[PDB]
Every structure is written in structure tokens, then in C-alpha cells.
Write a protein that binds this ligand. Structure first.
Ligand SMILES: [Zn+2]
Ligand SMILES: [Zn+2]
Lengths: 51, 144, 258, 66, 148, 115, 97
């Protein structure tokens, strides 16, 4: 699972434009702590862009 | 101490004294907005206390809708004169200071800590003893 | 068949506020208009700050928070701009956001005032309002301190964050003479008369009108600068009409799918 | 630390009015007359400038790290 | 046709004990015909009453000339011809006690009927032959109109 | 830490349904319109425009909890009329009123801007 | 005196019983001697109950704590069955005893 620890950008959905580092990932869901806010949200992996 | 531990407190107590005064008149939209928050309401709007010139409901009618079942209770308001009960106006109270709940309907009287508080024989106590814990829980929530 | 027929009088129209009176409408319509002024009129505001360098005495969230509150001229651009949650671009495109950059270094021996003049946009019509007066100070820089950042300003309305509130103060008033007794003064003579009171100095309240309902409503919509105040009112009426239209479409679907 | 951009209550812009306020104060205006000349009518915006403590002037007295 | 009591009263006293509520004033009235006594709480904001004002008091068990009983539910859309159309001030309440001067031996000569119109209380006391239609926990309609 | 995002005031999440009708059987000819992601802004205007209708016997709205974004409107009508029809008519009258208000406001702006 | 005026059932003033009791019951009470002896025994039992109360509560304080609020329950019965207190009752006193 290469997604964990990578800085990621949310590209679809209401959180579009939020940046963060993935904490734990599945094949369809990641736990992304948001850089912008003080939360770790759950986001579908189709809405994520690595950078 | 064979009384309730929990009663109507703070804002709801101040505003139920203000709400059940004799000159509190609610219009149609205000009554419907208040009936939206009555969980035990049967969907029938009561007949207004005044029908002409305009239909107005008193606060006692809406509280009679809040009061559950057919509770029968008699209290006195905090400002009840000591010489009123011996006077000619024993049952026609000039200051609305004698509370009579009859068939679960607030006939007259301003409610206060003496009626809706944690005292023995109060309205929430009579409601508990006659109606059970679930009906009295709904009574607390509906008042608030 | 029971719709109101409300009339409008503008009594004052400056570049910073519009003062108007609405007659022959209901209190709920007037209050929802006043609420959509504050909460549902979309403007452009900064909602994405990348800070490449920040040597100032204020931390990065402090700077970013101050940048979001800078008003940007949203007239005629916010209507054709997209919500970024609706836009199909990956990150940010000119159809949903306006890119701002700031690059200030202080090498002079005196304090540099990083104002909103230093915010430079790529769009020539979404600029800081104060840049279009004095400019809004973002940070003061000491010699050798610098602030370099890239900001994106997306479309949003004040129900989400107050930086998308287009209004400074929405004054609202009905029945200035208390002819409906919606407020009961314990002593009516202790109360100053309104700006719109029609009573002479002798009389404190109007006589109680038992048949009256609120019918005439006084507004003073001050604008923080993003939109012109008449654009605030027209966008609010359009937005309220659009909310009702969307609700009616969803309700038509739910009725025909019973 | 630094002047807020908006009035907390209403949202009027007061972040561009601090240096103008101090310039008026140096010009022997009373504080109420300086707030009147700046167009702060509501008392919510007047307490933004009236009660502001410019602490960033004190924080600029320390040399930067880099 | 459902008319429990009808009379003409003129106001003899307004708030003898002082104005205790802002919007409700207690009238003490006497009847010219039956020599009844009336104590009545009236919403004087929507229906002002002066001292010495003369009004025609009607207490009905129903608002319809048919005499047909209602349910106590607000029906604002009822186009049935109502007794309320001929009166300026209509209240709806429940008589809550009938006092009387009876003893253990002798029947009642003076009866008192106490009615609560949503908390606006009325006492109507007079001869016992005039208050036969009043029985406790029956919903009555007060109807009044000022006479000239 | 437990802060809801600011966009759940107004955004339907996937699978949330904007408005549902529930014909409550407690009283004849009444419905419960549960509108999601709305507040007092629409609830109050819909409630008052329903109260202008003479065939509407009851109209009230509530926010069950202010930390949730949900409006419950309860409409009861005369039996020759339905709460769904009352709700649609109320929204049409509100839309026509706001259209008239917008046009008269544009006329008044154009008159005062010129003079 | 007040105890006897309030709690002893008078059965000799028949024209007063005709207001509280219906005609069948008042004819039974004025005639049947077993009823009258039983009512007198009821009053006697309340008189020893009174003396026992005088012993138990020697300060004359009547406020007690008891399970069933009998007065409220009588009021509940009056409201449930729409008891008119201006009419003669159909309740035989021996049924009460
Ligand atoms: Zn885009
Ligand atoms: Zn302010």
C-alpha cells in the first residue's frame, strides 16, 4: 500500500482542494488528515490525487 | 422525600409563569408554531378562547394541551394573597393566583415553581403518580 | 393565487449601502430576504492559501485567516463562476477560482506594511476592494522578513463561512411606531423614536392597531465592498427564488414518485 | 496582535482604518471624532478601533530568525 | 336553540381591585332585567369596554342556530351560519363550578356559575331559575355586543 | 475535533433526499414535509404563504435540532384539497412574489440611479 | 360536635336524605333497621379510630404520609364518571360501608 504517508490532494467532492498526508489506506478508502483543518477525514480513493 | 427530584427550571420556569398569565393571547400562526413542538399533540387545534373580533388562544389552552391525561391538581401561585381564599373571590381569582388543573386542563392560575417544580403534590408529581414515567417524561419535554 | 404584490421604494443608494422600503409583503418574506442578504448571497473570497515563505511575526494560519476576510470585487464575475465542488477540474481552474499571489520582502530599514495592494490577481476584475481609501493591512514586516504565498479565491456564500458574507450591516425594521405592540415598552416615553417614526414629539407610541399585521419593512443594506448593495439585494432575491425553485423541482419528483 | 480585518459583530472592514485612525489621533482629534471621520457609526465597529492594542509593533522589535 | 342565558348588562365597575393585567380588565356588571350579577375578564385590547357601557350578554351552548353541538375543535372554514355573526365579542369556555346557597334541607335560590374562557374567568350569579342550563364541565360560548 | 464541516449546512450528502412526504394518520388530510439541508429561511416563508391559503387548516415548521439541518413542515388542509397541492401552490406564490419583487426592485434601482 | 356533624350519617331527616340519595335508597335507609345499625357501627368505628389518632398524633397535626391520595382519587372518579354534585346519588350507604 503505497498511499500511506504521501501528501494527497482531494480532487472530487465537497473537500475539493484540501491537502493532507494519508494515515491509513484501503483499496477504496483512505484516512487523510487534512492540512487545512484539524481533522482526519475518511475519503473515497477515487477523489484523491497524490502529489 | 416523596417528591420529584427534577422539575421545570430556569428559562422554562420564568417563561411558563409569563406564559400562563391571564392576558397572554396567541394568534393563529403562533399557536401552530407552538403546536409543532408538542410531541403528544393529537393534531386537533383547540377552539380559541376568544373567537371574535379575532381568534386568539390563551397560554392556558396551550398548556392544557401540554398537561397529560386528566390530571386533577390544585396549587397556588407564589403571589397568592393570604386573605383571598377567605374572600368573596375564592373561585374567581382577581390575580390569577390560584392554579386549578381539572381534567388535565389548566382552568386558571399562573404556574411557577410551586406548581411545576420539585415540590410534593406539584403538577409534575401528580402527573408521575397518575400517568407513569413515560407520560411524565413527555410532559417535561413538552413543557420545555 | 394568494401571492403578495410587494412594492419597493429606494430612499438612499450610495456606493456603500442601499436604503429601501418594501410594502405589502409578509414578515416572513421580509425576514427571509434579510437572512439571504447575510447568508445566501455568493461572493468570491480566498479559501486556499499556500504559504511558500512566512518570516513575519504572525503565524501561517493567522495570515491565511486574515487573507480570507479581505473582500474581493465579486460583481459580474461570481454569477458566471462555478462552485469548486461542482467544477470538473482537478484542482482549480479559471471557471471556479481566481488565483492571487503575494510576494513581499522588507529590505528597507523601516517597517513594511503588507497591505491588500500587494495581493496580485490573475483575473483583472476580482481584485481587493480597497485596491480598486486605504488598503487592508495583512501583516507588518521587519527588515529581512518576507511573506510569499499563493492564494485561490473560490465562490461561496455566507452560510458556510462569514468571509463570504457580502454585507456589513443589514438594518431591518418594521412598524417603527409600535402600532402592533410586537414589543411592549414598560415606559414608552423612555424610548427614542426611530428614523422612520411618524409621531410628533408629544406621542410615544402609535395607537394600537388590532387589525394590523407587519406590512411595511425598512432595510438598510450596507455592503462590505464585494458587491454593490443593489447587487446584494438582486442576488438575494434571485437566490431565494432559486432555492424555492429547486425545492419545488424536488417536491414535484417526490409527488410524482409516490 | 494586529488590527482585525472585519468587525467581529457586523463584518465591516476595519483593517484599513487603523493607520488612518492613528493619523487622526496624531492630528489632535478626539477618539470619538476620529471614529466619526472614519465612518464607524455602529458601536460594534467603534470598539474594534477604540479597544485595539497594536501588539505587532512590539513583536517587530525583535530581530527575525533568518 | 341552545341559548343557555340571555340578558342585558351595564358595566358598574372596571377593575375594583386595580388593573392586574395589561390586556385583560375585569368588569363588574349588573343586569337590568333579571337582576343578575356579572364578573367578567375581557380582553380589552381587542375589545375595549368603558365604565357605564351597556352590552347584551348571551351564553350559548353552541354557535349554530340549529342547536347542533360542536366538538370544541377550531374550524375556521365552517360556512354554516353562526350565532357569532351578530356579536362583536365571542369567547369559548368551560363552566367549572356551580356554587349555590343550598343547605342540607332547602334547595338553592341563588346560583353562581363560574366559567373559564381559556383562563379569562366569568362568574354569573343570580336567581336559580336563570342558571338551569349551566352544568359543570359543559362548554359554553359567551357572546356579547355593545348596545347603543 | 468533532467539528462538522461548514458545508453540511446546505449540501446533501450522497443518498440524502431533499424532501420527503409522510402522510401522518393522526388527523385527516395532513402531511409532514421533511426537508433536508434547509433552515428557517425557507421554513418560515413556506409556513406563512401556507397560512395565507384559506384551504389550509394547519401550517407550521420546526427545526428538530439546530445542530442538524432539517426542516419538518406540517400542513393540514380541508378535505377538498391536499397538503401536497398546498405546498406546491405556496411555493409558486412565493416564486411569483419574489419575481415581482425583483422586477420592481430593478425598476426602482434604475429610477434612482438616473434620478 | 364538628366530628359528629361531619361524619355521622343522619338517617332521621328524610327530606335532607332525599337531596343526597335517590328515592329507592332513602326509602331503604328510613325503613331497614339493619342499615341503620350498620351505619351507627360505622360511626362508632370512626370514633375509636379518632381516639387512636388522638393517641398517635398528640400535637393535633393532621398532615400524614400515606400511599393512596384518596381525595385526588375521589376527584378523579368525579371527573371520569361526570358526577354531578347537584343531583341525588344512586350510591347506597351500605354499599360504601
Ligand atoms: Zn474549476
Ligand atoms: Zn461592526
Amino acid at each position: 500500500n503505497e498511499l500511506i504517508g504521501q501528501t494527497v490532494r482531494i480532487s472530487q467532492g465537497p473537500y475539493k482542494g484540501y491537502i493532507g498526508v494519508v494515515k491509513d489506506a484501503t483499496e477504496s478508502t483512505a484516512r487523510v488528515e487534512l492540512h487545512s483543518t484539524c481533522q482526519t477525514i475518511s475519503v473515497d480513493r477515487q477523489r484523491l490525487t497524490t502529489v | 422525600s416523596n417528591r420529584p427530584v427534577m422539575g421545570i427550571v430556569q428559562d422554562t420556569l420564568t417563561a411558563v409563569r409569563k406564559f400562563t398569565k391571564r392576558d397572554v393571547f396567541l394568534e393563529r400562526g403562533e399557536v401552530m408554531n407552538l403546536l409543532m413542538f408538542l410531541s403528544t399533540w393529537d393534531g386537533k387545534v383547540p377552539q380559541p378562547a376568544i373567537l371574535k373580533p379575532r381568534p386568539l388562544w390563551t397560554g392556558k389552552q396551550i398548556f392544557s394541551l401540554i398537561i397529560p391525561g386528566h390530571i386533577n391538581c390544585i396549587r397556588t401561585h407564589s403571589t397568592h394573597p393570604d386573605d383571598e381564599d377567605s374572600g368573596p373571590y375564592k373561585h374567581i381569582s382577581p390575580g390569577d393566583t390560584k392554579v386549578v388543573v381539572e381534567n388535565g386542563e389548566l382552568i386558571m392560575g399562573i404556574l411557577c415553581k410551586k406548581s411545576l417544580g420539585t415540590s410534593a403534590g406539584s403538577l409534575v408529581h401528580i402527573s408521575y403518580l397518575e400517568m407513569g414515567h413515560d407520560i411524565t417524561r413527555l410532559f417535561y419535554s413538552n413543557i420545555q | 393565487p394568494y401571492a403578495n404584490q410587494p412594492t419597493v421604494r429606494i430612499t438612499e443608494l450610495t456606493d456603500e449601502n442601499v436604503k429601501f422600503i418594501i410594502e405589502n409583503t409578509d414578515l416572513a418574506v421580509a425576514n427571509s430576504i434579510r437572512r439571504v442578504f447575510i447568508a445566501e448571497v455568493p461572493i468570491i473570497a480566498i479559501d486556499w492559501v499556500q504559504i511558500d515563505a512566512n518570516s513575519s511575526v504572525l503565524h501561517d494560519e493567522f495570515i491565511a485567516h486574515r487573507l480570507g476576510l479581505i473582500p474581493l470585487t465579486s460583481d459580474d464575475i461570481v454569477d458566471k463562476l462555478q462552485y469548486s465542488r461542482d467544477c470538473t477540474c482537478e484542482e482549480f481552474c479559471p471557471e471556479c477560482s481566481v488565483e492571487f499571489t503575494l510576494d513581499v520582502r522588507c529590505n528597507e530599514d523601516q517597517t513594511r506594511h503588507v497591505t491588500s495592494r500587494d495581493l496580485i490577481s490573475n483575473s483583472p476584475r476580482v481584485i481587493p476592494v480597497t485596491s480598486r481609501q486605504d488598503d487592508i493591512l495583512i501583516v507588518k514586516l521587519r527588515k529581512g522578513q518576507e511573506l510569499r504565498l499563493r492564494a485561490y479565491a473560490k465562490k461561496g456564500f455566507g452560510k458556510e463561512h462569514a468571509k463570504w458574507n457580502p454585507t456589513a450591516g443589514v438594518a431591518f425594521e418594521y412598524d417603527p411606531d409600535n402600532a402592533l405592540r410586537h414589543t411592549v415598552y414598560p415606559k414608552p416615553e423612555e424610548w427614542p423614536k426611530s428614523e422612520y417614526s411618524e409621531l410628533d414629539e408629544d406621542e410615544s407610541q402609535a395607537p394600537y392597531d388590532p387589525n394590523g399585521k407587519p406590512e411595511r419593512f425598512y432595510y438598510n443594506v450596507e455592503s462590505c465592498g464585494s458587491l454593490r448593495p443593489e447587487t446584494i439585494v438582486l442576488s438575494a432575491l434571485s437566490g431565494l427564488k432559486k432555492k424555492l425553485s429547486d425545492l419545488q423541482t424536488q417536491l414535484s419528483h417526490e409527488i410524482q414518485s409516490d | 496582535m494586529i488590527i482585525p480585518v472585519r468587525c467581529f459583530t457586523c463584518g465591516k472592514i476595519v483593517g484599513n482604518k487603523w493607520e488612518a485612525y492613528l493619523g487622526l489621533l496624531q492630528a489632535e482629534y478626539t477618539e470619538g471624532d476620529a471614529l466619526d471621520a472614519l465612518g464607524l457609526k455602529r458601536y460594534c465597529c467603534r470598539r474594534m478601533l477604540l479597544a485595539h492594542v497594536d501588539l505587532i509593533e512590539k513583536l517587530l522589535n525583535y530581530a527575525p530568525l533568518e | 336553540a341552545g341559548i343557555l342565558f340571555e340578558d342585558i348588562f351595564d358595566v358598574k365597575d372596571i377593575d375594583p381591585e386595580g388593573k392586574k393585567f395589561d390586556r385583560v380588565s375585569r368588569l363588574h356588571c349588573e343586569s337590568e332585567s333579571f337582576k343578575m350579577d356579572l364578573i367578567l375578564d375581557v380582553n380589552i385590547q381587542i375589545y375595549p369596554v368603558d365604565l357605564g357601557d351597556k352590552f347584551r350578554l348571551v351564553i350559548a351552548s353552541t354557535l349554530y342556530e340549529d342547536g347542533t353541538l360542536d366538538d370544541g375543535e377550531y374550524n375556521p372554514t365552517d360556512d354554516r351560519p353562526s350565532r357569532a355573526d351578530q356579536f362583536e365579542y365571542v369567547m369559548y369556555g368551560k363552566v367549572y363550578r356551580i356554587e349555590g346557597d343550598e343547605t342540607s334541607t332547602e334547595a338553592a335560590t341563588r346560583l353562581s356559575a363560574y366559567v373559564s374562557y381559556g383562563g379569562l374567568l366569568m362568574r354569573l350569579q343570580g336567581d336559580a331559575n336563570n342558571l338551569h342550563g349551566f352544568e359543570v364541565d359543559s362548554r359554553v360560548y359567551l357572546l356579547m355586543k355593545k348596545l347603543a | 475535533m468533532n467539528a462538522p464541516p461548514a458545508f453540511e449546512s446546505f449540501l446533501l450528502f450522497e443518498g440524502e433526499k431533499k424532501i420527503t412526504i409522510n402522510k401522518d394518520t393522526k388527523v385527516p388530510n395532513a402531511c409532514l414535509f421533511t426537508i433536508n439541508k434547509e433552515d428557517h429561511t425557507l421554513g418560515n416563508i413556506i409556513k406563512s404563504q401556507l397560512l395565507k391559503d384559506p384551504q389550509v387548516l394547519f401550517a407550521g415548521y420546526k427545526v428538530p435540532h439546530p445542530l442538524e439541518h432539517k426542516i419538518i413542515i406540517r400542513v393540514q388542509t380541508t378535505p377538498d384539497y391536499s397538503p401536497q397541492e398546498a405546498f406546491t401552490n405556496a411555493i409558486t406564490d412565493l416564486i411569483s412574489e419574489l419575481s415581482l419583487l425583483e422586477e420592481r426592485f430593478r425598476v426602482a434601482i434604475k429610477d434612482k440611479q438616473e434620478g | 360536635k364538628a366530628f359528629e356533624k361531619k361524619f355521622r350519617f343522619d338517617y332521621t331527616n328524610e327530606r335532607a336524605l332525599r337531596r343526597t340519595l335517590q328515592e329507592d335508597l332513602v326509602k331503604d335507609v328510613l325503613s331497614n333497621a339493619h342499615i341503620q345499625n350498620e351505619l351507627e357501627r360505622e360511626f362508632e368505628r370512626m370514633r375509636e379510630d379518632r381516639e387512636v389518632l388522638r393517641v398517635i398524633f398528640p400535637t393535633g397535626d393532621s398532615k400524614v404520609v400515606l400511599p393512596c391520595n384518596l381525595l385526588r382519587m375521589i376527584w378523579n372518579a368525579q371527573k371520569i364518571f361526570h358526577i354531578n354534585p347537584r343531583l341525588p346519588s344512586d350510591l347506597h350507604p351500605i354499599k360504601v360501608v
